[PDB]
Amino acid sequence: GDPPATVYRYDSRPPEDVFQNGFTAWGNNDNVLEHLTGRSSQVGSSNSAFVSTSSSRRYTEVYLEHRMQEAVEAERAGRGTGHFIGYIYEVRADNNFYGAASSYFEYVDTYGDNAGRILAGALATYQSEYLAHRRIPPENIRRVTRVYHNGITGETTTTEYSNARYVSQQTRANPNPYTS
Ligand SMILES: Nc1ncnc2c1ncn2[C@@H]1O[C@H](COP(=O)(O)OP(=O)(O)OC[C@H]2O[C@H](O)[C@H](O)[C@@H]2O)[C@@H](O)[C@H]1O
Ligand SMILES: NC(=O)c1cccnc1
């Protein structure tokens, strides 16, 4: 019943960056609906105040696999090399991580939605999702799984290593919804 002590994040950026610097959110837009619909992320206004994570490692693997498959399709069509490297970061959650579901229900029951119209064509999703407000320090980042895909040979290689900067502290995600 406790909030998760560990969450996961798929990101394209390599540990030389992330292990040293942590994750910082795009900007100061802490509207939960705009984030969960994807409107404030990289593909939208790139100003979200949240860093998305999941209590489900499988969720982040599916996400990684989708991006890898896009590279595979690009090579098959002559519009890419097929090369892809994706990373799944294992992260210790603390009180600055908020459950997406509870944050979403509170938000939309108060200010409402506009389904399909917040981002265009997007519904708000949130199942195993946890939102870190503004930043995840490098000290929270435990390890990474590196998935390397050779675009021409098709071989996929997976390796794992820990972050020297990780600090073992006793924390878990916030039990409460995010409120602005
Ligand atoms: N601060 C940054 N600086 C440079 N690149 C960044 C930065 N943040 C992200 N990227 C790059 O931007 C890429 C995407 O990271 P993100 O914008 O956080 O979005 P998501 O993928 O977590 O999903 C966010 C929400 O959207 C959907 O609704 C989801 O379900 C979530 O609810 C990173 O891999 C990096 O290449
Ligand atoms: N970037 C991610 O791993 C992620 C986790 C949960 C929801 N959306 C994105």
Swiss-Prot record:
Q: Please tell me one Gene Ontology term that the record gives under cellular component.
A: extracellular region
Q: What class of enzyme is it?
A: transferase
Name the domain of life.
Bacteria
Q: What is its EC number?
A: 2.4.2.-
Q: What, per the annotation, is the impact of changing residue 55 to G?
A: Very low amount of final toxin secreted; approximately 50% of wild-type toxin level accumulate in the periplasm despite near wild-type levels of mature size S1 in the periplasm
Residues of the active site are 35, 129
Q: Its Gene Ontology biological processes?
A: symbiont-mediated activation of host G protein-coupled receptor signal transduction
Which coarse location class describes where this protein primarily resides?
secreted
Additional comments on file?
Answer: Thiol:disulfide oxidoreductases DsbA and DsbB are required for periplasmic toxin assembly, whereas DbsC is important for extracellular toxin secretion.
Official protein name in the record: Pertussis toxin subunit 1
Recorded source organism is Bordetella pertussis (strain Tohama I / ATCC BAA-589 / NCTC 13251)
